[PDB]
Amino acid sequence: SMNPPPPETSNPNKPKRQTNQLQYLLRVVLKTLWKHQFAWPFQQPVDAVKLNLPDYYKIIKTPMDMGTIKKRLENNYYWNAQECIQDFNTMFTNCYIYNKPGDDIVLMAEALEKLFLQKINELPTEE
Ligand SMILES: Cc1cnc(Nc2ccc(N3CCN(C)CC3)cc2)nc1Nc1ccc(Cl)c(NS(=O)(=O)C(C)(C)C)c1
């Protein structure tokens, strides 16, 4: 009957940077996925109360979504590109853990993940 608080998106004491790689992760990677026709189920934390999935946050213990990633990038929350890439991978993996192969939600994640991988293949060299 309860959703957890969302993942952290603000922390003044956290070491953080703007790098050219992190800029690419916002301007290219996040922007490309966000505009996709299948983005919407991933644009905010899963509301497991509204979806009637009482097991969701009992099974998915490291939730992640693109709304959170977008805020983190906009706030320059990350230290490096790998931290942000990990958030995307957590989001995709969580989808495949929770759902059945071939479910619509899985097909949607797979389309986003394909694009993600194509974009990160061209992640620029740092600095
Ligand atoms: C990120 C994410 C990961 N996993 C799941 N899993 C999930 C599993 C079973 C359901 N239900 C269960 C019983 N219902 C009658 C059918 C769907 C919903 C979501 N959702 C996610 N987001 C999400 C957000 C908003 C909505 Cl409306 C949905 N619904 S949906 O998946 O059915 C679809 C997008 C295909 C319409 C999903």
From Swiss-Prot:
> What does the record say about PTM?
Phosphorylation by CK2 disrupt the intramolecular binding between the bromo domain 2 and the NPS region and promotes binding between the NPS and the BID regions, leading to activate the protein and promote binding to acetylated histones. In absence of phosphorylation, BRD4 does not localize to p53/TP53 target gene promoters, phosphorylation promoting recruitment to p53/TP53 target promoters.
Q: Where is this cross-link: Glycyl lysine isopeptide (Lys-Gly) (interchain with G-Cter in SUMO2)?
A: 58
Q: Which residues form the Bromo domain?
A: 17-123
| Compartment annotation | Nucleus; Chromosome
Question: Where, by tissue, is this protein expressed?
Answer: Ubiquitously expressed.
- The residues annotated as site (Acetylated histone binding) are 99
The lineage's top-level taxon is Eukaryota
Biological role:
Chromatin reader protein that recognizes and binds acetylated histones and plays a key role in transmission of epigenetic memory across cell divisions and transcription regulation. Remains associated with acetylated chromatin throughout the entire cell cycle and provides epigenetic memory for postmitotic G1 gene transcription by preserving acetylated chromatin status and maintaining high-order chromatin structure. During interphase, plays a key role in regulating the transcription of signal-inducible genes by associating with the P-TEFb complex and recruiting it to promoters.
What the entry says about domains is: The NET domain mediates interaction with a number of chromatin proteins involved in transcription regulation (NSD3, JMJD6, CHD4, GLTSCR1 and ATAD5).
Query: Its family?
Result: Belongs to the BET family.
Q: How does it assemble?
A: Interacts with p53/TP53; the interaction is direct. Interacts (via CTD region) with CDK9 and CCNT1, acting as an associated component of P-TEFb complex. Interacts with RELA (when acetylated at 'Lys-310'). Interacts (via NET domain) with NSD3, CHD4, BICRA and ATAD5. The interaction with BICRA bridges BRD4 to the GBAF complex. Interacts (via NET domain) with JMJD6 (via JmjC and N-terminal domains); the interaction is stronger in presence of ssRNA and recruits JMJD6 on distal enhancers. Interacts with NSD3. Interacts with NIPBL. (Microbial infection) Interacts with bovine papillomavirus type 1 regulatory protein E2. This interactions may serve for the tethering of viral genomes to host mitotic chromosomes allowing successful partitioning of the viral genome during cell division.
What more does the entry say?
Answer: JQ1, a thieno-triazolo-1,4-diazepine derivative, and I-BET, a benzodiazepine derivative, have been tested on tumors with success. Treatment with GSK1210151A (I-BET151, a I-BET derivative) has strong effets on mixed lineage leukemia and promotes myeloid differentiation and leukemia stem-cell depletion.
Listed name of the protein: Bromodomain-containing protein 4
Q: Which organism is it from?
A: Homo sapiens (Human)
- The gene it comes from is BRD4
